[PDB]
Write a protein that binds this DNA or RNA. Structure first.
Ligand SMILES: [K+]
Ligand SMILES: [K+]
Ligand SMILES: [K+]
Ligand SMILES: [K+]
Ligand SMILES: [K+]
Ligand SMILES: [K+]
Ligand SMILES: [K+]
Ligand SMILES: [K+]
Ligand SMILES: [K+]
Ligand SMILES: [K+]
Ligand SMILES: [Mg+2]
Ligand SMILES: [Mg+2]
Ligand SMILES: [Mg+2]
Ligand SMILES: [Mg+2]
Ligand SMILES: [Mg+2]
Ligand SMILES: [Mg+2]
Ligand SMILES: [Mg+2]
Ligand SMILES: [Mg+2]
Ligand SMILES: [Mg+2]
Ligand SMILES: [Mg+2]
Ligand SMILES: [Mg+2]
Ligand SMILES: [Mg+2]
Ligand SMILES: [Mg+2]
Ligand SMILES: [Mg+2]
Ligand SMILES: [Mg+2]
Ligand SMILES: [Mg+2]
Ligand SMILES: [Mg+2]
Ligand SMILES: [Mg+2]
Ligand SMILES: [Mg+2]
Ligand SMILES: [Mg+2]
Ligand SMILES: [Mg+2]
Ligand SMILES: [Mg+2]
Ligand SMILES: [Mg+2]
Ligand SMILES: [Mg+2]
Ligand SMILES: [Mg+2]
Ligand SMILES: [Mg+2]
Ligand SMILES: [Mg+2]
Ligand SMILES: [Mg+2]
Ligand SMILES: [Zn+2]
Lengths: 147, 53, 118, 49, 101, 111
RNA sequence: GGUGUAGUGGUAGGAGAGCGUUCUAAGGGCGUUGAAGGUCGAUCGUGAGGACGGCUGGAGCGCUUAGAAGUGAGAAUGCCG
RNA sequence: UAUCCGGGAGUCAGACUGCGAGUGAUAAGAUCCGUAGUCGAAAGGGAAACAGCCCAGACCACCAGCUAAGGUCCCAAAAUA
RNA sequence: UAGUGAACCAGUACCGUGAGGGAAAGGUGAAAAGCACCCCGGAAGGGGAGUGAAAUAGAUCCUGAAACCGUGUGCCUACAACAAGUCAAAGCUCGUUAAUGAGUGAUGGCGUGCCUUUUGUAGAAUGAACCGGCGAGUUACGAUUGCAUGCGAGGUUAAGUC
């Protein structure tokens, strides 16, 4: 009968969640956040429409890195100039720019397309326990069981 | 060196996007009112800056 | 008895072009390119008439999983519980209930959880 | 009989098979000659015996 | 109020006054038809069939028999000088739902 | 009854170059078109000017329309018959030459 | 014609059955109240393909049975435009 | 299903994989045999992509269900069992 | 593009020192009634006005396809990596052989052209610039097999005459 529900843009209300990264493995935090951002947690999920929720990640500076990742997990990036390979350790990124660390982790998990990037734009990472989005009245999201 | 592939109509039109003329500096002649190029003698009345020449 | 080309060739090529209407430039203008594209169009259409069922079952599975999580269960547990409870509702209907009739989906989930407990 | 109702006896006349007239006919392209070789050429094939 | 009926190897949501397309039913147009495999009845309250709701039925009238738009299956293997074209029109029966029980 | 057309057929000029000029005048008042064509130095400018003046003359004499209100509603160039020529290139070969022609049409309406 | 069982990927290639084109014979028709041809359309058949409407066009052409073939093009660094 | 009789062929460049040998260096996506499979002539699922490996043989329609190999944190369906 | 190379001032034009080679090119309309006259323009060519059933039949003249070019726009498009499509699809526009309609289409999934030849080709192996036309298992005489008809331990004429 071709009656499967297909969500539309704008008709779905996107809510705001706050996720605390304190002592949570980077990958597991990224996985739960990516699921929420894509909207896999709601029955109205539609692959070709953005239906996920906004996420504010706090205390990113305290994200957990098991094993020796703090010094051994290396993030590479190439300027595209010859010999232009630059590398930074996960520990250094966590200490200096944790926002970038979390954003890279979540990007690696989101789809690599226009919809994926638009969903990525809904992610806000803040080292520390304070964020400027009180106006959005975000609700805390417990993730101890989800991880 | 020769075109490996023929240029499509869309690509040809895109390249020609900037292949166009322009008409600039036309304004009313103070003497007869006919349009003229600024800083040029009006070809109609032969005046320029309010004097016949 | 000479049989010249006639109009059959034009008719056939025009049929191909009409099938090719809506393609990019030469792919709808030229007969050869149109036929080449139309053949690939047939190939993709035949393969997609199979892939479509896969895709919609996948979507229903995802939505049912989300609803089960909201009801405190995983998709696999919910389906096992429904099978034990002797419910034959399929994934299309379950996803439709999950989206539209949350109360009905919750009742189904409660029955599945009861069956799992038993 | 009537000239406008002619009908041959069944199986008396068959339709000639024409090769090289499309693939679906079963004799397109190679015309049933196979691929290359002497027998695939015009006027090809060896003398009897 | 609505129901879910198991028809033609598939399950269809049905409401009174709505028309549903199903696999060809061997029933003449304009005649009454009854679906007895009702797996759920929803609305104000929900009735769950295990697998079928006990004694539930859905009554409809066959509005029309028809054929869906043509589907072309064109199977070919590139470079193998081999293609096969086939047409199809899947018969369907449109049923207007009169009563849900 | 409200619009008049003029056409110059088989004019010896490049259709693309003629279109370059035509794009200027298309959709503008008759006075603006006349000024633009007069002060445009491109070869096709004079030919388009003659065609436009002929169109205005028709819209006035034949249909007694208001010249002062006229606007160039439509104007285009179409490819015409192409004369074939040959230019002898190096090493004894010849190269074809397409001497192209234009059909210039200008339609001017009351408003 | 119904029921049941089983089967229906396919190159070389074998077998069978059909679509379409020109012309011929017979019959039966259609055409300045508009044929063929061209163009557009959301039409029908399992396929090749077959109608039906609008516009253009201006004088020939379908249908049924049978018959004969210069009978079907997308490629040959094919030929001509 | 085998035989036999007759009409019509195409085929005589094979490839890899497993197992048993030779040549080779107990090298080769090597070469040459035996044996089985697949490709050849086989689409579909898995192995990222990937003819020859694993599962499995497409007559079609479905916005139905159960499984194979392989998998169930996100990309990406299913256990943060 | 057939039919003589030649339907037409063709063995011509043209090519070659020469022998020799060798084209292209038919169609207004029933009847020229082949657009008097006026307007723009130097003319060409157009717009009227007329002839005509028809002039989008105006001499490049029956029809007028495709490649190709242009004009106007219903929809989409300037963060996107696209064998160009197919499946799913919001939105916008429009209403047909009235059909669970049509055009476009953000966005998401899947997805390396056709042919030839190869063990194997998306192939960085070959061929095609595109469109149109033409272009390849035929005929004659015999051999043999299947099928069909006639006759049947028989069958049958050939040349030739009317
Ligand atoms: K053969
Ligand atoms: K028609
Ligand atoms: K060719
Ligand atoms: K045999
Ligand atoms: K082996
Ligand atoms: K005419
Ligand atoms: K357009
Ligand atoms: K797509
Ligand atoms: K290759
Ligand atoms: K080469
Ligand atoms: Mg032909
Ligand atoms: Mg399946
Ligand atoms: Mg014969
Ligand atoms: Mg074959
Ligand atoms: Mg071929
Ligand atoms: Mg060959
Ligand atoms: Mg060979
Ligand atoms: Mg051979
Ligand atoms: Mg010289
Ligand atoms: Mg099969
Ligand atoms: Mg004819
Ligand atoms: Mg032929
Ligand atoms: Mg080898
Ligand atoms: Mg082979
Ligand atoms: Mg395969
Ligand atoms: Mg292959
Ligand atoms: Mg299962
Ligand atoms: Mg998943
Ligand atoms: Mg675990
Ligand atoms: Mg000739
Ligand atoms: Mg006309
Ligand atoms: Mg004409
Ligand atoms: Mg960006
Ligand atoms: Mg954009
Ligand atoms: Mg090789
Ligand atoms: Mg070679
Ligand atoms: Mg080439
Ligand atoms: Mg060609
Ligand atoms: Zn002046």
């Amino acid at each position: 009968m071709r009656t499967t529900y297909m969500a539309k843009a704008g008709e779905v209300e996107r809510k705001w969640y706050v996720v605390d990264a304190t002592d949570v493995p980077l990958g597991r935090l990224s996985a739960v956040v990516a699921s929420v951002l894509r909207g896999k947690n709601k029955p109205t999920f539609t692959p070709h429409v953005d239906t996920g929720d906004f996420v504010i990640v706090i205390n990113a500076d305290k994200v957990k890195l098991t094993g020796k990742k703090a010094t051994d997990k290396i993030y590479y990036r190439h300027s595209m100039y010859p010999g232009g390979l630059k590398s930074v350790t996960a520990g250094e990124l966590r200490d200096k720019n944790s926002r970038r660390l979390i954003e890279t982790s979540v990007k690696g998990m989101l789809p690599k397309n226009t919809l994926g990037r638009k969903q990525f734009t809904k992610l806000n990472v803040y080292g520390g326990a304070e964020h400027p989005h009180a106006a959005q009245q975000p609700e805390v999201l417990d993730i101890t069981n989800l991880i | 060196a020769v075109p490996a592939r023929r240029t499509s109509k869309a690509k040809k039109a895109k390249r020609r996007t900037h292949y166009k003329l322009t008409i600039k500096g036309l304004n009313a002649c103070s003497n007869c009112g006919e349009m003229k190029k600024s800083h040029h003698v009006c070809p109609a009345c032969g005046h320029y800056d309010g004097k016949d020449v | 008895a000479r049989v010249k080309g006639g109009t059959v060739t034009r008719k056939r090529r025009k049929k191909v072009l009409k099938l090719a209407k809506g393609y990019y430039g030469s792919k709808h203008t030229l007969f050869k390119s149109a036929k080449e594209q139309v053949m690939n169009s047939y190939y993709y259409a035949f393969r997609d008439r199979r892939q479509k069922k896969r895709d919609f079952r996948k979507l229903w599975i995802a939505r049912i999983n989300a609803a089960a999580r909201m009801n405190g269960l995983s998709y696999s547990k919910l389906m096992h519980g429904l099978k034990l409870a002797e419910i034959d509702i399929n994934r299309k209907m379950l996803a439709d209930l999950a989206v539209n009739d949350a109360a009905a989906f919750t009742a189904l989930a409660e029955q599945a959880k009861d069956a799992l407990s038993k | 009989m009537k000239l406008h109702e002619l009908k041959p006896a069944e199986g008396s006349r068959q339709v000639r098979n024409r090769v090289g007239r499309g693939t679906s006919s079963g004799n397109g392209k190679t015309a049933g000659r196979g691929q290359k070789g002497q027998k695939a050429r015009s006027g090809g094939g060896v003398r009897l015996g | 109020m609505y129901a879910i009926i198991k028809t033609g190897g598939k399950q269809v949501k049905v409401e009174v006054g709505q028309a549903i397309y199903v696999e060809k039913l061997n029933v003449e147009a304009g005649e009454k038809v009854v679906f007895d495999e009702v797996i759920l009845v929803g609305g104000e309250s929900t009735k769950v069939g295990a697998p079928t709701v006990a004694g539930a039925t859905v009554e409809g009238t066959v509005e029309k028999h028809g054929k869906q738009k043509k589907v072309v299956t064109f199977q070919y293997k590139p470079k193998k000088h081999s293609h096969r074209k086939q047409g199809h029109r899947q018969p369907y029966t449109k049923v207007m739902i009169e009563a849900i029980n | 009854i409200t619009s008049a057309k003029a056409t110059a057929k088989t004019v010896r000029t490049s259709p693309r170059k003629a279109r370059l000029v035509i794009d200027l005048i298309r959709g503008k008042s008759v006075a603006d078109a006349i000024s633009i064509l007069k002060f445009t130095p491109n070869k096709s400018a004079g030919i388009i000017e003659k065609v436009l003046m002929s169109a205005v003359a028709n819209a006035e004499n034949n249909f007694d329309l208001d010249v002062e209100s006229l606007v160039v509603s439509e104007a285009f160039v179409n490819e015409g018959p192409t004369m074939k020529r040959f230019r002898p290139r190096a090493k004894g070969s010849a190269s074809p030459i397409n001497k192209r022609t234009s059909h210039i049409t200008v339609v001017v309406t009351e408003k």
